[PDB]
Amino acid sequence: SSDTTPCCFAYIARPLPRAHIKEYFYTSGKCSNPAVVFVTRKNRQVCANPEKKWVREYINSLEMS
Amino acid sequence: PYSSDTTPCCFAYIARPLPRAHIKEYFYTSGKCSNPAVVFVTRKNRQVCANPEKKWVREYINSLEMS
Numbered sequence: 001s002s003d004t005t006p007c008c009f010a011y012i013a014r015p016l017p018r019a020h021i022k023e024y025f026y027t028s029g030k031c032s033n034p035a036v037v038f039v040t041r042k043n044r045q046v047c048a049n050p051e052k053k054w055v056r057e058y059i060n061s062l063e064m065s
Numbered sequence: 066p067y068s069s070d071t072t073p074c075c076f077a078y079i080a081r082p083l084p085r086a087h088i089k090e091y092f093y094t095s096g097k098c099s100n101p102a103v104v105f106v107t108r109k110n111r112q113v114c115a116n117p118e119k120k121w122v123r124e125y126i127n128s129l130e131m132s
């Protein structure tokens with residue numbers, strides 16, 4: 001029920017704890033900066049750099065379900 | 066330096082004025098966003114993007130600041 005789009009303007013500096021992430025999604029291409037959003041169990045939407053190794057690894061684990 | 070949590074931005078503006086009585090709050094999207102924008106929060110808690118340059122948008126804001 002919202003017309004807004006979540007975008008990222010900064011990336012979290014250190015790897016987020018894997019245990020508390022329930023899913024992820026890529027921010028819209030409309031956004032100026034590319035980004036991966038890790039959603040935590042407390043519904044925090046954390047921005048991360050798609051080029052980081054840990055980020056790609058977390059995505060892989062979330063993709064294997 | 067800035068929050069690493071997602072921030073809402075607008076990429077489209079509602080074409081015509083929303084019913085004034087259905088609006089309870091408003092807020093400008095971050096200056097970090099590509100487009101300047103006003104987001105009106107309706108009483109059903111929906112969020113609508115609007116153009117700050119529009120006359121009705123500025124008037125709605127002036128009204129909201131009174132209530």
Ligand SMILES: O=C(O)C1=C[C@H](O)[C@@H](OS(=O)(=O)O)[C@H](O[C@H]2[C@H](O)[C@@H](NS(=O)(=O)O)[C@@H](O)O[C@@H]2COS(=O)(=O)O)O1
Binds near residue numbers: 068070072093094097
């Ligand atoms: O209380 C807020 O509404 C608010 C809190 C956060 O500090 C930040 O949210 S955000 O990281 O998702 O954007 C935001 O603070 C500022 C925001 O940084 C400003 N944009 S900027 O000048 O480009 O940096 C602008 O949008 O105003 C926000 C709130 O102003 S404040 O209430 O005085 O802090 O919003």
